[PDB]
Amino acid sequence: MHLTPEEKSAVTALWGKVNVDEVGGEALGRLLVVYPWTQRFFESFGDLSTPDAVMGNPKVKAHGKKVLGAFSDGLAHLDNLKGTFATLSELHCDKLHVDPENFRLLGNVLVCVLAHHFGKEFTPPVQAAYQKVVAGVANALAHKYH
Amino acid sequence: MHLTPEEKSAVTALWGKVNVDEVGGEALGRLLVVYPWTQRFFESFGDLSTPDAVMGNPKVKAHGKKVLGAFSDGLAHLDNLKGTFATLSELHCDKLHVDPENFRLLGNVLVCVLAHHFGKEFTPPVQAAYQKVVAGVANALAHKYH
Amino acid sequence: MLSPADKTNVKAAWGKVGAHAGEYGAEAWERMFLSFPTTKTYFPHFDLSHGSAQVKGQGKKVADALTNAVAHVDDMPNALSALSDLHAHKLRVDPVNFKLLSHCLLVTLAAHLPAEFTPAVHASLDKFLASVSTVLTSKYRGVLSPADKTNVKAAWGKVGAHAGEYGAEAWERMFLSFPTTKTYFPHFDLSHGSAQVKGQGKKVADALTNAVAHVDDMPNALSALSDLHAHKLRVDPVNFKLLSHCLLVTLAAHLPAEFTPAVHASLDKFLASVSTVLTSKYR
Ligand code: HEM
Ligand code: HEM
Ligand code: HEM
Ligand code: HEM
C-alpha cells in the first residue's frame, strides 16, 4: 500500500494515541447498531435488540478488541497489506463466510469513531489518509475470496 | 490484469466476431438511454430527446466507435492495462472531468450488449471472464485520477 | 419512477419469458455466482454446482416472486411484503448484492430475448429490477421512526448557526478523501478556505435545514433540487453516499456529546432518505 510521507506520518501519529480496546468495542458496536443486518454473524453474542444492549455487550466489546488489534498490526506493515492479511482473508471467506462489503462498512464506521473521539485533531487531511488505509485493509481482507 | 490462459482465450475468441463500430454505437447509445444522467457530457451531440434519436445519433455512433476502438486495443494488452491506459486516464480526469463511475456503468452495458448479440454463445463462464476485463479496464481508466 | 410505459414494457418482456421463468431464473443465479464470487458467501449451505436442485429451486422461487411483482407492479410493497420482511429480518443480505443479481438477470434476458430486448425495454427492465430491490431492502432499517425524527432534530438544533461552517467542512473532507467527486466542479477553486467551497457548503446546509424542518414532507420541500440534480447537474447517485459519510464525520468531530450510537444511526438513515429524494427523478 502506498501513501505520501505526509499521509503515513498522520496515520501513525494518531494511532499512537488510540486505545485499541476502547475504540475497537466502539467501532464494532456502532456497526451493529447503524447497519443491523451485520448482526447476522453474531447470533451467539447475546441480545442485540437495542443500541444500549449492543454497546454494553461484553462479547461485542471483546471481539471489537480482537478485530482492531489485528487492524493495528496491519498498520505496522502498510507496504504489504495483502501478504499481511492473507491468512485472515482466507479465514473470513472459507470458514466464516463474511461478505467483504462488511469490511468497507466497518472502515467507515471506524473513521466516524476516530472523528468522534479526537474531534478537531481529526482534520480533513488526516481523514483522507485514514480513508485510504481502511480501503487498503478491506481490499487486503477480500483478496483471497473465491 | 490476471486472467487464466482459458479466460484470456475465451475473451479473444468472441471479440474476433465483434463488429466494433456497430457494437460501440450500440453500447454508448444504450448507456445514454438506460442511465440518462450520462448524457451530461454530450450536450453538443444534437438530439438525445428519445431512445430512437439517441440510437440514431451519428455523433453518438461515432463516439461509440472511438471508445470501443480504444477498448479493442486494450484487449491486446490484458497484462498491462494500467500502462496502456495511463494517458487516457489523465485525460479523462484533468480535461474531460468524467466521473469514473461512468466507466463501470459502460462496462455493464457492454456485457449486456454482448449477451444480446451472441445469445447462447455468451455463456456464464464467458460472461465471468468479460466481467473481469471490464472491471480491469474501469480500474485502469480511473487509476490516474487525483 | 415506473411509468405505465415502463410497466407496459416489463409486462411484454416477462410474458415472453413465460414458462421459462424458472430456467432463466436458475441461469441468472449461476451467472452471478461465477461472475461475483463474493455472493456465494450467502449460500454456504448449498451445493452450488451447475444444475443442482438447490440452485434450480432458488431460481424458480425468485422467478415466481418476480412474476408476482410484474402482476402487481402498482402495488409492489404489498405484493412483496413477506419477502421484504424475510430479507430484512432473517437473511440479512447486504443491499449491494441486489444490484449484482439484477445485472445478471438483465444479461440472462438479453441472451434469451433478442427480439424483445430493445433499448427502451432494457431501460424499463433495469428500472423495474431496481424498484424490486428497493422494496426488498426497505425494512432493513425502515422509514424514519418518531425516535429518528427526534434525534435528527435534536442534533441539527445543536448544529444551529454553525450549519454553514460544518457544510463547508463536509465538502472539504469529501474532495480530499474521495478525489473523483472533484470532477463535478472543474470551475471551482478547491483549495482550503476557498469561498467557492464555503458557498457550496452553506447552500447544502441550508437545504438540509429545510429538510429537517420538513422531515415529514421532504419530497415536496426538496422538489426543485431533485429536478436540478436529475436534469441539469446530473451527478451520479453513488456520490451522495460519499457526501453523507463526510457529513457524518463532520458532525461527529463537532458534537462529542450529541453523537451517540443511536443518534448516529438516525442521522445515517436521515441522510439516506435525503439522498433517495434527491435522486428520485433521475429516471
Ligand atoms: C478490519 C476488519 C477486520 C479484521 C482485521 C478482522 C479480524 C478478525 C480476527 C483477528 C478474528 C479472530 C479469529 C480467531 O480468533 O481465530 C476475526 C473473527 C471473526 N470476524 Fe473478523 N475482522 C474484521 C472484520 C470483520 C467484519 C466486518 C465482520 C462481520 C461483520 C467480521 C466477523 C468475524 C466473525 C464472525 C469472527 C468470528 C467470531 C467468533 O468466533 O464467533 N470480521 N476477525
Ligand atoms: C471503456 C471506457 C472508455 C474508453 C476506452 C474511452 C476512450 C476514449 C478515447 C480514446 C477518447 C479520445 C481522446 C482523444 O481525442 O485523444 C475519449 C474521449 C472522450 N470520452 Fe472516453 N472512453 C471511455 C469511456 C467514457 C465514458 C463512459 C464517457 C462518458 C459517459 C466518456 C467520455 C468522453 C468524452 C466526453 C470524450 C471527448 C469527445 C470529444 O472531444 O469528441 N468516455 N474516450
Ligand atoms: C430481486 C432480488 C431477489 C428476490 C426477488 C429474492 C427472492 C427470494 C425468495 C422468493 C426466496 C425464497 C423464500 C422461501 O424459501 O419461501 C429467497 C431466499 C433467499 N435469498 Fe433472496 N431474492 C433476491 C435477492 C437475493 C440476493 C441478491 C441474495 C444474496 C446474494 C439473496 C439470498 C437469499 C438466500 C440466502 C435465501 C435462502 C435460500 C435457502 O436457504 O433456501 N436473495 N429469495
Ligand atoms: C445531501 C446531498 C445534497 C444536497 C442537499 C445538495 C444541494 C444542492 C444545492 C442547495 C445546490 C445549489 C442550488 C442553487 O444554486 O439554487 C446544489 C448545487 C450543486 N450540487 Fe448538490 N447537493 C447534494 C449533493 C451533491 C453531490 C454529492 C454532488 C456532487 C459530488 C453535488 C453537486 C452539485 C453541483 C455540481 C452543484 C452546482 C455548483 C455551482 O455550479 O454553483 N451535489 N446542490
From Swiss-Prot, chains A, B:
<feature type="site" description="(Microbial infection) Cleavage; by N.americanus apr-2">
    <location>
        <begin position="45"/>
        <end position="46"/>
    </location>
</feature>
<feature type="site" description="Not glycated">
    <location>
        <position position="59"/>
    </location>
</feature>
<dbReference type="GO" id="GO:0006954">
    <property type="term" value="P:inflammatory response"/>
</dbReference>
<dbReference type="InterPro" id="IPR012292">
    <property type="entry name" value="Globin/Proto"/>
</dbReference>
<feature type="binding site" description="proximal binding residue">
    <location>
        <position position="92"/>
    </location>
    <ligand>
        <name>heme b</name>
    </ligand>
</feature>
<dbReference type="InterPro" id="IPR002337">
    <property type="entry name" value="Hemoglobin_b"/>
</dbReference>
<feature type="modified residue" description="Phosphoserine">
    <location>
        <position position="44"/>
    </location>
</feature>
<dbReference type="InterPro" id="IPR050056">
    <property type="entry name" value="Hemoglobin_oxygen_transport"/>
</dbReference>
<feature type="modified residue" description="Phosphothreonine">
    <location>
        <position position="50"/>
    </location>
</feature>
<dbReference type="GO" id="GO:0070293">
    <property type="term" value="P:renal absorption"/>
</dbReference>
<feature type="site" description="(Microbial infection) Cleavage; by N.americanus apr-2">
    <location>
        <begin position="122"/>
        <end position="123"/>
    </location>
</feature>
<dbReference type="GO" id="GO:0005615">
    <property type="term" value="C:extracellular space"/>
</dbReference>
<feature type="site" description="(Microbial infection) Cleavage; by N.americanus apr-2">
    <location>
        <begin position="110"/>
        <end position="111"/>
    </location>
</feature>
<keyword id="KW-0408">Iron</keyword>
<feature type="modified residue" description="Phosphothreonine">
    <location>
        <position position="12"/>
    </location>
</feature>
<feature type="domain" description="Globin">
    <location>
        <begin position="2"/>
        <end position="146"/>
    </location>
</feature>
<feature type="modified residue" description="N6-acetyllysine">
    <location>
        <position position="59"/>
    </location>
</feature>
<keyword id="KW-0225">Disease variant</keyword>
<feature type="binding site">
    <location>
        <position position="1"/>
    </location>
    <ligand>
        <name>(2R)-2,3-bisphosphoglycerate</name>
    </ligand>
</feature>
<dbReference type="GO" id="GO:0042542">
    <property type="term" value="P:response to hydrogen peroxide"/>
</dbReference>
<feature type="site" description="(Microbial infection) Cleavage; by N.americanus apr-2">
    <location>
        <begin position="128"/>
        <end position="129"/>
    </location>
</feature>
<keyword id="KW-0597">Phosphoprotein</keyword>
From Swiss-Prot, chain C:
<protein>
    <recommendedName>
        <fullName>Hemoglobin subunit alpha</fullName>
    </recommendedName>
</protein>
<dbReference type="GO" id="GO:0031838">
    <property type="term" value="C:haptoglobin-hemoglobin complex"/>
</dbReference>
<dbReference type="GO" id="GO:0072562">
    <property type="term" value="C:blood microparticle"/>
</dbReference>
<feature type="site" description="Not glycated">
    <location>
        <begin position="90"/>
        <end position="232"/>
    </location>
</feature>
<feature type="site" description="(Microbial infection) Cleavage; by N.americanus apr-2">
    <location>
        <begin position="108"/>
        <end position="251"/>
    </location>
</feature>
<comment type="subunit">
    <text>(Microbial infection) Interacts with Staphylococcus aureus protein isdB.</text>
</comment>
<feature type="modified residue" description="N6-succinyllysine">
    <location>
        <begin position="11"/>
        <end position="153"/>
    </location>
</feature>
<feature type="site" description="Not glycated">
    <location>
        <begin position="99"/>
        <end position="241"/>
    </location>
</feature>
<comment type="function">
    <text>Involved in oxygen transport from the lung to the various peripheral tissues.</text>
</comment>
<dbReference type="GO" id="GO:0005576">
    <property type="term" value="C:extracellular region"/>
</dbReference>
<dbReference type="GO" id="GO:0005615">
    <property type="term" value="C:extracellular space"/>
</dbReference>
<dbReference type="InterPro" id="IPR050056">
    <property type="entry name" value="Hemoglobin_oxygen_transport"/>
</dbReference>
<dbReference type="InterPro" id="IPR002338">
    <property type="entry name" value="Hemoglobin_a-typ"/>
</dbReference>
<feature type="glycosylation site" description="N-linked (Glc) (glycation) lysine; alternate">
    <location>
        <begin position="40"/>
        <end position="182"/>
    </location>
</feature>
<keyword id="KW-0561">Oxygen transport</keyword>
<keyword id="KW-0479">Metal-binding</keyword>
<feature type="modified residue" description="Phosphoserine">
    <location>
        <begin position="138"/>
        <end position="280"/>
    </location>
</feature>
<keyword id="KW-0325">Glycoprotein</keyword>
<feature type="modified residue" description="Phosphothreonine">
    <location>
        <begin position="8"/>
        <end position="150"/>
    </location>
</feature>
<dbReference type="GO" id="GO:0015671">
    <property type="term" value="P:oxygen transport"/>
</dbReference>
<keyword id="KW-0360">Hereditary hemolytic anemia</keyword>
<feature type="site" description="Not glycated">
    <location>
        <begin position="56"/>
        <end position="198"/>
    </location>
</feature>
